[PDB]
Short mmCIF file of C-alpha atoms and ligand atoms in Angstrom, two decimals:
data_model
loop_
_atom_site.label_atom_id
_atom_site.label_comp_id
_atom_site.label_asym_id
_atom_site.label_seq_id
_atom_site.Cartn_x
_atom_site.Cartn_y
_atom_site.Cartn_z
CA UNK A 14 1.48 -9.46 -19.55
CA UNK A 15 4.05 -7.19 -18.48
CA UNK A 16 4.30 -3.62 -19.78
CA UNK A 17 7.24 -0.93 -19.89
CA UNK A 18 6.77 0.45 -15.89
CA UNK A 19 6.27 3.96 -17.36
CA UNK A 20 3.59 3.09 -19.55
CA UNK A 21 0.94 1.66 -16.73
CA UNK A 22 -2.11 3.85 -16.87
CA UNK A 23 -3.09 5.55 -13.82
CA UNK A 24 -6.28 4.26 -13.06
CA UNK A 25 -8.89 6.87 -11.76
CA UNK A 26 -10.21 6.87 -8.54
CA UNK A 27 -14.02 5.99 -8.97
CA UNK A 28 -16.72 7.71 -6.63
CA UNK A 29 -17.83 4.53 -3.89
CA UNK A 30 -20.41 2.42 -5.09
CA UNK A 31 -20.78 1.38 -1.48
CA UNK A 32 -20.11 1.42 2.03
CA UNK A 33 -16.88 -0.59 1.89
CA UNK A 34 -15.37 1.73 -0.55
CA UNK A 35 -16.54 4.90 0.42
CA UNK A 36 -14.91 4.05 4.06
CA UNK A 37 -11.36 3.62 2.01
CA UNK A 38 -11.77 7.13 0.83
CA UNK A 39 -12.63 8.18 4.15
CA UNK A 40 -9.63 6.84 5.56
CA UNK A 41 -6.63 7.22 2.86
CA UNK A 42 -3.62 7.99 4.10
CA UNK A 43 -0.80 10.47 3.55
CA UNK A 44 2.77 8.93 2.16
CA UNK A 45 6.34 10.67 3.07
CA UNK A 46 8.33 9.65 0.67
CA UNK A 47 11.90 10.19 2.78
CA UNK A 48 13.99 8.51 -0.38
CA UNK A 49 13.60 6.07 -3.18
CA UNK A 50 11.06 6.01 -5.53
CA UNK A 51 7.37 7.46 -5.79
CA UNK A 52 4.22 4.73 -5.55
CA UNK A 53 3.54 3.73 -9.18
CA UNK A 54 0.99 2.01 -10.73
CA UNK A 55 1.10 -1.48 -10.79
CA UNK A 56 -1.78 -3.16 -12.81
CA UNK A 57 -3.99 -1.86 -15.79
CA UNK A 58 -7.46 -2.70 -16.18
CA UNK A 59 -6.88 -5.61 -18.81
CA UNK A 60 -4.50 -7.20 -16.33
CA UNK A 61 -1.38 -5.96 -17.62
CA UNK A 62 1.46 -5.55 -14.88
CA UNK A 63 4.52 -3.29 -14.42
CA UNK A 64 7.57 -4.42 -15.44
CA UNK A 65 9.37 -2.24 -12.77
CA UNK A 66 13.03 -1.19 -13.28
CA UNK A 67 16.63 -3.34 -12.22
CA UNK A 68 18.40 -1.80 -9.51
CA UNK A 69 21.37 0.16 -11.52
CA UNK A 70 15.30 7.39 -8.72
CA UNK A 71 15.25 9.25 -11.75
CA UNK A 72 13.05 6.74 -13.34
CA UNK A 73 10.99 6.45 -11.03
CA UNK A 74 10.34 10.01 -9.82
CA UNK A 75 7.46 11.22 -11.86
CA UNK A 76 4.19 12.46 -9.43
CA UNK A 77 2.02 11.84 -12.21
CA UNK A 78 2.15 8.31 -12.00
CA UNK A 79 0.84 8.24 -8.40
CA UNK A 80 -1.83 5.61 -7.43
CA UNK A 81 -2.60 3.59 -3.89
CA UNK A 82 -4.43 0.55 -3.54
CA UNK A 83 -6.69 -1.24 -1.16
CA UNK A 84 -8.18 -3.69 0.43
CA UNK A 85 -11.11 -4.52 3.25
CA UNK A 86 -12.07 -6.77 5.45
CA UNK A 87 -12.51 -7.92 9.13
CA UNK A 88 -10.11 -9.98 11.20
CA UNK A 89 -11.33 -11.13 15.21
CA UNK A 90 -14.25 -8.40 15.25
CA UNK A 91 -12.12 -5.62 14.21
CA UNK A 92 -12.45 -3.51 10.62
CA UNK A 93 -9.75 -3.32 8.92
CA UNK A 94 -8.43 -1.49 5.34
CA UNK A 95 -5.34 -2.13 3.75
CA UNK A 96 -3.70 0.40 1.76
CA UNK A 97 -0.94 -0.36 -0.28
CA UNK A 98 1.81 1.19 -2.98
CA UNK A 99 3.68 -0.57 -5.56
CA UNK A 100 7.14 1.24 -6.55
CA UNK A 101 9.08 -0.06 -9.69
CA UNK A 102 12.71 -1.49 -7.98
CA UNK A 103 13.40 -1.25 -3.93
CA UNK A 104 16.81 -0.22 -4.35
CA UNK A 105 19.12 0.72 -1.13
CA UNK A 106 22.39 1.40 -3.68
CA UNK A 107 23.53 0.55 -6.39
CA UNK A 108 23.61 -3.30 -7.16
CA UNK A 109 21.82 -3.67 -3.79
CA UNK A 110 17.62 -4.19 -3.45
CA UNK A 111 15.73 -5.73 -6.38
CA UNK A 112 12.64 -5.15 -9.26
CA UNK A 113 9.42 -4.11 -7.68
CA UNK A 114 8.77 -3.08 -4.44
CA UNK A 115 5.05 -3.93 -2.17
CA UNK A 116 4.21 -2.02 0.96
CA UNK A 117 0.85 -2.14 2.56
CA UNK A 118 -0.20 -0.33 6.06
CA UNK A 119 -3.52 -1.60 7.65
CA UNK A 120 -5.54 1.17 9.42
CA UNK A 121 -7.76 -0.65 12.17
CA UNK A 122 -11.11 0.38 13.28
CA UNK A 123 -13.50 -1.08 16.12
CA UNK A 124 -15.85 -2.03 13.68
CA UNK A 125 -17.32 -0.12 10.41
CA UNK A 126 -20.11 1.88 11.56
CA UNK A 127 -18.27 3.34 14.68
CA UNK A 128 -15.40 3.69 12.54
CA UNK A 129 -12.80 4.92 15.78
CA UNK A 130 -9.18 3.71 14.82
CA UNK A 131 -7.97 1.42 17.41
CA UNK A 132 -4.40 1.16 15.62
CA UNK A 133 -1.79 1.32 12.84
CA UNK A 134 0.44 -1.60 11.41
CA UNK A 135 3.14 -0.56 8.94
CA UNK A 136 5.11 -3.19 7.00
CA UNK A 137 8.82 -3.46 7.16
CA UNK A 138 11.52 -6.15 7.36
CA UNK A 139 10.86 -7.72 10.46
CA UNK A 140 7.50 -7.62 10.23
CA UNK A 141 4.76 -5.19 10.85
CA UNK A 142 5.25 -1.83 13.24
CA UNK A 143 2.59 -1.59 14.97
CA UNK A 144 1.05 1.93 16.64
CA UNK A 145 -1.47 1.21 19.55
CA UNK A 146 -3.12 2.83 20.18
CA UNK A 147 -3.03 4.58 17.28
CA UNK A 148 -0.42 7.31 18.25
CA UNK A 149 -2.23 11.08 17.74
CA UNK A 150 0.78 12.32 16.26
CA UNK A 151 0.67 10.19 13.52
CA UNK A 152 -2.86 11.31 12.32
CA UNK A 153 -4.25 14.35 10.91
CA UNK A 154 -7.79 13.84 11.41
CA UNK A 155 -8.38 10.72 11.04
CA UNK A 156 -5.54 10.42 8.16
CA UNK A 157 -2.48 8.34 8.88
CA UNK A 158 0.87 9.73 8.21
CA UNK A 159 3.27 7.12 6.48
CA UNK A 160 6.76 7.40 5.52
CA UNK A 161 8.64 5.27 2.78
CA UNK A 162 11.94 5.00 3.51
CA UNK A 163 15.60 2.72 3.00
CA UNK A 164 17.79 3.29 6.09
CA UNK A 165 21.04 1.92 4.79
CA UNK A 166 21.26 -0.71 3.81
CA UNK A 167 18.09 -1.87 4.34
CA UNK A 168 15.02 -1.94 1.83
CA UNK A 169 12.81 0.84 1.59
CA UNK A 170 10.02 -0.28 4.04
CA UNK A 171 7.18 1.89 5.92
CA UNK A 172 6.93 3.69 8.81
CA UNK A 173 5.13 6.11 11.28
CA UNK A 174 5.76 9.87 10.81
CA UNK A 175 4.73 13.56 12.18
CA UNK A 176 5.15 14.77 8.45
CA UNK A 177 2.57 15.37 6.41
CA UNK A 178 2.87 13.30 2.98
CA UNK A 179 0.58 13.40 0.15
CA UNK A 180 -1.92 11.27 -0.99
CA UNK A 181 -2.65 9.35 -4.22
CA UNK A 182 -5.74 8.13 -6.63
CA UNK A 183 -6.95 4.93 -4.71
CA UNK A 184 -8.04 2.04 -6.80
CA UNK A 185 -9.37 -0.55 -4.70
CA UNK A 186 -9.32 -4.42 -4.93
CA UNK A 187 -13.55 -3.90 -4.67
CA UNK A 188 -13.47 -1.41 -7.97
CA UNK A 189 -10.62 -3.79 -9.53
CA UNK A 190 -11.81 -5.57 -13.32
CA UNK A 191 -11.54 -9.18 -12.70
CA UNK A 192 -8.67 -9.43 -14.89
CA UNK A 193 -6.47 -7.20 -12.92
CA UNK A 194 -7.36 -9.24 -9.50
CA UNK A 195 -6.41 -12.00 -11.46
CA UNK A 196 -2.85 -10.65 -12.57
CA UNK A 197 -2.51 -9.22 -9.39
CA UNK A 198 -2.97 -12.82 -7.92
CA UNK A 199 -0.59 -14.55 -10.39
CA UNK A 200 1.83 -12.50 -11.52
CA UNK A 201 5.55 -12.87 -9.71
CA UNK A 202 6.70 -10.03 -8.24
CA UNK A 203 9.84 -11.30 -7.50
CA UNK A 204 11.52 -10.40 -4.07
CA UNK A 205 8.07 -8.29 -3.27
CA UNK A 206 4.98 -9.59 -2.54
CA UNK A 207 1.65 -8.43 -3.07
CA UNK A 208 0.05 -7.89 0.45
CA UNK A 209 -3.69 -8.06 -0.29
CA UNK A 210 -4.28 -11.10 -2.65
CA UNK A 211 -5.18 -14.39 -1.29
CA UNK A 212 -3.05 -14.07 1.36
CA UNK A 213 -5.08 -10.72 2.58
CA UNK A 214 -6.24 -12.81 5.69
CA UNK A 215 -2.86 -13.98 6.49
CA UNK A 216 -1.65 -10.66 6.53
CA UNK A 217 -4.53 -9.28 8.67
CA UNK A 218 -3.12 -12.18 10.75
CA UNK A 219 0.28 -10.28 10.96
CA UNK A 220 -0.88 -6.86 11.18
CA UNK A 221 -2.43 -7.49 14.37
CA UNK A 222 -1.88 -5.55 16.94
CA UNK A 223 -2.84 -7.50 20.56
MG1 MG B 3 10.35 -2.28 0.28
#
């Protein structure tokens, strides 16, 4: 059930058993976080789920708690990985925003063995940005540079940056315990959504980018 938002284990990234995972090493990106909080973990191994926090960062601040998700598949012959962050509350101000907070960008490739990225998608409010091609000044190497920001008084949504950002332990949907891909599945988020559930194909849908 749910669990104090400070209390979710970081779960360790796990070396890839396979192909599929060892490509979402490969291709983690860096996160900017401009403002707001730090990526948190959202889901323990025995399908526990963070409580987050009400919006009223201090809370929500702590590096140790980092942790990125994701998700792969293929959508109309293209490869595609989803990585995602959960962040307790998405709060703008003050009695503005809400508990919990889901942002997912979806790194394209031409197909898996190639492995060239053809494009970025980054969610926000209006739906995806989209970078294509994928804009060189948004990659170091063949790392994506994300930001996580609110302008105000928007929600804190992603974006494309020149910074460098940091990067996270990735536990992915493929390494998940059945019980937390079950939680993650059924559990209400609220106002946020989790991107790469059964709706990961509809979202692939969105994320397109021509
Ligand atoms: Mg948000």
């Amino acid at each position: 059930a749910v669990i104090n938002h400070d209390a979710v284990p970081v779960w360790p990234q796990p070396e890839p058993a396979d192909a599929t995972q060892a490509l979402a090493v490969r291709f983690k990106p860096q996160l900017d976080v401009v403002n707001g909080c730090q990526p948190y973990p959202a889901v323990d191994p025995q399908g526990n789920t963070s409580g987050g926090l009400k919006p009223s960062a201090a809370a929500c601040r702590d590096m140790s708690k980092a942790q990125v998700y994701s998700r792969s598949g293929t959508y109309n012959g293209y490869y595609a990985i989803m990585y995602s962050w959960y962040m307790p509350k998405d709060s703008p101000s003050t009695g503005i925003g809400h508990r919990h907070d889901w942002e997912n960008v979806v790194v394209w490739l031409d197909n898996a063995a190639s492995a060239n990225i053809v494009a970025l998608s980054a969610s926000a409010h209006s739906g995806y940005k989209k970078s294509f091609p994928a804009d060189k000044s948004y990659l170091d190497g063949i790392t994506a540079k994300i930001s996580y920001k609110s302008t105000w008084p928007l929600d804190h949504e992603l974006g494309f940056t020149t910074s460098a950002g940091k990067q996270q332990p990735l536990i992915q949907w493929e390494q998940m315990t059945q019980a937390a891909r079950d939680a993650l599945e059924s559990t209400d988020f609220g106002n946020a959504n989790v991107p790469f559930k059964s709706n990961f194909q509809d979202k692939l849908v969105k994320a397109f980018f021509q």
